[PDB]
Amino acid sequence: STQSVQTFGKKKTATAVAHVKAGKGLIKINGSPITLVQPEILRFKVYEPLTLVGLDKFQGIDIRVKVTGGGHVSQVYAIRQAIAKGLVAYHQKYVDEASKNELKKIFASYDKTLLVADSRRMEPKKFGGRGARARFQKSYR
Amino acid sequence: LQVVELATTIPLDVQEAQREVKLFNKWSFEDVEVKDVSLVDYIQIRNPVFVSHTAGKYASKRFRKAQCPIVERLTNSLMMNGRNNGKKLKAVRIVKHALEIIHVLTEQNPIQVVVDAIVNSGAREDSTRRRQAVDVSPLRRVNQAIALLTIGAREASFRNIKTIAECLAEELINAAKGSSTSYAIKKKDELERVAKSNR
Amino acid sequence: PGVSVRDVPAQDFINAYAQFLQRQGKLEVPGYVDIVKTSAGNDLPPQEAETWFYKRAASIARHIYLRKQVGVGALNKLYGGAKNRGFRPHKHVDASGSINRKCVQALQKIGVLEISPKGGRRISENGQRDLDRIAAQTLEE
Amino acid sequence: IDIAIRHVLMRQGVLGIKVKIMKDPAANRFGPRALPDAVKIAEAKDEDEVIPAPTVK
Amino acid sequence: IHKIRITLTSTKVKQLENVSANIIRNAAQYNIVKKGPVRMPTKVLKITTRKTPNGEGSKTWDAYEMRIHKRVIDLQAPASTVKRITQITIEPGVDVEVTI
Amino acid sequence: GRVRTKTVKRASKVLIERFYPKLTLDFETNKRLTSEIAVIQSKRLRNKIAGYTTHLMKRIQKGPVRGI
Amino acid sequence: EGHNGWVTSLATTPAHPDLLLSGSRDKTLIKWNQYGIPKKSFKGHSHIVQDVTISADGAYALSASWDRTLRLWDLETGETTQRFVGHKGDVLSQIVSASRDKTVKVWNTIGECMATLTGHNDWVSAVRISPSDQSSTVISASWDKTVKSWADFIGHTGYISCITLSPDGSLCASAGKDGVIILWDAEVHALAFSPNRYWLAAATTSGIKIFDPEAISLAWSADGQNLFAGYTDNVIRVWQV
Amino acid sequence: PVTLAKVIKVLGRTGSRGGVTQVRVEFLEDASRTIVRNVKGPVRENDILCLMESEREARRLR
RNA sequence: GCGAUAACGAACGAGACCUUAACCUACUAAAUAGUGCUGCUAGCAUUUGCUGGUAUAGUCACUUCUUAGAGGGACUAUCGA
RNA sequence: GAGCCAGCGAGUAUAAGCCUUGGCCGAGAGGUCUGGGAAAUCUUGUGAAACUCCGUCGUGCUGGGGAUAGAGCAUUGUAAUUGUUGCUCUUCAACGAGGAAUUCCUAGUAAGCGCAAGUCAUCAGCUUGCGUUGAUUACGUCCCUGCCCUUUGUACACACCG
């Protein structure tokens, strides 16, 4: 062990575990660069942990993520949230608490999701209706 | 001005987002203004976002929706017609092709084009039950503006080779100029034309 | 710093590997690739009908490359779509087994895939180099 | 609550009998010993005899 | 020194935890190593059946559940001791089985 | 809304009547004290009692209140 | 100023002047307007962080929390070295220890309870080892009108918040719920002595007294020109003198 | 024309189904011309209501 | 519920309760979970690096991720009306 | 064609057979030889489907839609004729957004999309659950349909369907 942190990040059921150890600016997704995963549109959500604060926070740290679960959008949101958490935890235990306070202020001034995970779950399906709230059609006479 | 080359390469345009948050890194959310002050406190463009997909909690509290990007508002309003419910990636692709096609046609900023179209597509006189004609609230005028724009586009794109983003573009152009060639602007004629008789 | 298959978009990677493997002309394209259909839950043959098998072979070879010890059933379920069952609702159906078996066996004889211990086919030692070098050309552009 | 239900086979038909008993929770051993909303604040032993500056040793 | 495995399941959590602590105490009077306990995810046997004994009324359903909890502990000890370690723990409601 | 039922209110009244000097104006200290004083069989009920007791104390400071 | 909560703990060290470890209730004790500058945030506490004092070596810190553990941190590296466990109650003060179990347990260097002296009756309050070279005696205090010392300093009109000691181990000042500050041979919370003067700087709820948000810690500085005390309004309000 | 009137105080929700609500408006040019009107949609204080005439009174509608 | 009172004291229902969803890098353990390190390897590059593979013996370490038991956590807490 | 992202569950051994992986044949349905699993161990990361990309089509009952019908290949079953169901070729019907009416719904909700479990030799356009994508509009009212409490009238009490 040289310099490492371990943080996660979640959404609907998608879970992303980060591995931010000391490195050379390498930022990967399951072994692939931030420049592509599957999509072409939503890349900027996971660009946000970078463009808000600049690339210089990642000069000597290398990050690995093992996202599994949920769906494409859920995985993207979980990944970017986990990246933000990992960067903050690195600044906490290694770099500077004042630095992490400035970073989390940037995040919370942009999006509370970056630090505060969304606590929403699919409400269970009830008998007498196809959905949680939707009901079978009523036929008076 | 800042060279931060790391182990993985990051493209030139993505190295243009450090100094201005931009929708698709192509439009500026710092110059567009609203013609009238009664449609300002219920719209937020002073908070640029790269994408029209945040999926915020804008239905929880009472006026939680007031703090919603106009781009997400329009994009969400395109998710209708039933078969298109819960297809938001398709809608964001449509809106980016929109912004592009408007910019190829317009000389102003398409953000400004849409903001003007929306602030000029909210009818001022509409009536409730004869119906006693009353003056509509700001947020309501806004939401019928976006709703009518998306409708007009949707029913123009039905049985038409002109694609959905193209119909959206034409509707936005016609509603931006204030001319009675847009589906919303002609409805903006009918609502007041009926409502005046109702007083 | 080099480059591998994980650094490239899938579309162009499978495009290049398929067109190259077609350029060689040593892959045993089955004599039925013009009559047969890709899936029982499919309604038409591939449109680019004279070279679709090479596209499928490139995609399959990359699919083993990214993993280990996959078999014919897993690939059949991977390439199966949603049948149009008529008035009845949609459903996942498995793709063609004979096509996939012949494809992996031809990839065997070109030495691109090997028969792994206790089930499945891994990738061959030379196949790793082939795919990596063919990936390194696209990223230079 | 413990319930026993029986079918009493009479001459004219079947009678049904139900017997519910609400045992006191005090005799409950392998479970709760009081109702949920039963609260058992106790008395006080605060009162005592004091003096300002004592140190007995 | 062997690889005796103890695995035990029940429907009641408290009795199972008491008997597991009992086998821990019994292996702690001696000095048998205790790799576990390890807790398998609980099985929930769900039965959804219609309340009405016929077909009349509003459509209401009962969701009956049986819950099954399994635990494993790996003991490295001579084959003699694990016999008593297990057969002296016959606490009701917990079915225990021994495998090498 | 959150209207406190009669069980919590009577519990708080008897706490204040029988242990006034010990009770404080802090919800956390009141929690740890009501754990020691009463034998509520639920965390939620204990918390509601203790918090409403804290509110009652914070009212009592500004003059006597009728009922205690 | 960075605490999100109520700053209840303050201590100083005679080995590293300008080092301030301000506590709080927000699970974090922090290393330290434009004057107060934060240094490091210590992560690993479950609940209210009652008090912390810098060890005599001038390097580490000994933390207490309402989660029934004494937490031994590492200031220089931001690590914790030992997690003392065994008090069945919130802890709020060989090293002596006080907790809601109404029992004092003794913890050694690695940390393994070895002595279990007992004899109080209600929530033994803050305890301090006497800096008296004459004897290793301790003046303990509790909430049962008892300041028994290991000498019974009893007879109070109620529970007592805490105790403080002289820099030579000769005088202790008992104050808290007992409005009068009884001293042997309103509500006070943060009374402490000084090693350089003749003062009685405390932090009563009503106000500050010598000889609204509230200061639970009013520790003296090392140099003797500071009396800053962290109120519940999240700021410590540096005071020069 | 379109006169601009800023609602300063919020009344109850009148109307048949309760959709409409009474509002008291002011004017940034004719300041002491507070006139009661009724709004179709949601309303808050300080919400400027761009009207089209200001010579009519709305009190209660069916 | 606060209160008003020819009532006073009660009881059921409601609420409590139980199950489940959300939080815990804070205890306890995972060879049927995982992360690392270390062997034996492969493709790229040869800077010790980037991607992986295998070893339930390496008689490796640990518990962020997952599992489950013991608990904690909201009480509308603080503040303005 | 290419990308191949969940969650809830279920499973047997002298069967009359369970989930079934791998290998090999056939376009497919399906067949066969082995292997694992009484199961956080294998089936299974159930690589689900909507969805994303790049191509063909190009406003039309047209590559929309997949009825009805013939031929053929299998599977379960003692027995498929009144097609059990699965697959292949061909046949290519109504239907261009629906009258008077009427149902459901407030946030991870509606709608979309599949998936598993029950029924089960075979058969799911059905229910019971589960997750994936994920909205517009209120956050009010008693106009309608009703419900609760008080006052009031009553020739009602089978209680205004009096």
Coordinates of C-alpha atoms in Angstrom, one line a residue, chain H:
Chain H
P1 CA -51.5 47.3 -24.4
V2 CA -49.8 45.0 -21.8
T3 CA -49.6 46.7 -18.4
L4 CA -47.3 45.1 -15.8
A5 CA -48.8 44.4 -12.4
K6 CA -46.9 42.8 -9.5
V7 CA -49.0 40.8 -7.0
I8 CA -48.1 41.7 -3.4
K9 CA -50.6 39.6 -1.4
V10 CA -52.3 36.3 -2.1
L11 CA -56.1 35.8 -1.5
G12 CA -58.0 32.5 -1.5
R13 CA -58.7 30.3 -4.4
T14 CA -62.1 31.3 -5.8
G15 CA -63.9 29.8 -8.8
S16 CA -66.1 26.8 -9.5
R17 CA -63.6 24.0 -9.1
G18 CA -61.2 26.3 -7.3
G19 CA -58.8 26.5 -10.2
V20 CA -58.7 30.3 -10.3
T21 CA -57.5 32.5 -7.4
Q22 CA -58.0 36.1 -6.4
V23 CA -54.9 38.3 -6.4
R24 CA -54.1 41.9 -5.5
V25 CA -51.9 43.7 -8.0
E26 CA -49.9 46.9 -7.9
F27 CA -48.1 48.9 -10.6
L28 CA -44.6 50.0 -11.1
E29 CA -45.9 53.2 -12.9
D30 CA -49.2 53.9 -11.2
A31 CA -48.1 52.7 -7.7
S32 CA -51.3 53.5 -5.7
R33 CA -53.7 51.7 -8.0
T34 CA -54.0 48.3 -6.2
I35 CA -56.7 46.4 -8.0
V36 CA -58.0 42.9 -7.1
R37 CA -57.8 40.4 -10.0
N38 CA -58.1 36.6 -10.3
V39 CA -55.4 34.3 -11.8
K40 CA -56.0 31.1 -13.8
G41 CA -52.8 29.3 -12.6
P42 CA -50.4 29.1 -9.7
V43 CA -49.5 32.3 -7.9
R44 CA -46.9 33.6 -5.5
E45 CA -46.1 36.9 -3.9
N46 CA -44.0 39.4 -5.9
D47 CA -45.1 37.6 -9.1
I48 CA -45.5 40.3 -11.7
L49 CA -48.7 39.7 -13.7
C50 CA -48.4 41.2 -17.2
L51 CA -52.0 42.1 -17.7
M52 CA -53.7 43.6 -20.8
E53 CA -56.1 46.1 -19.1
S54 CA -56.4 47.7 -15.6
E55 CA -59.9 49.2 -15.5
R56 CA -61.9 46.2 -14.3
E57 CA -62.6 44.6 -10.9
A58 CA -62.7 40.8 -10.2
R59 CA -64.2 39.8 -6.8
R60 CA -65.8 36.3 -7.0
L61 CA -66.8 34.1 -9.9
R62 CA -69.1 31.1 -10.0

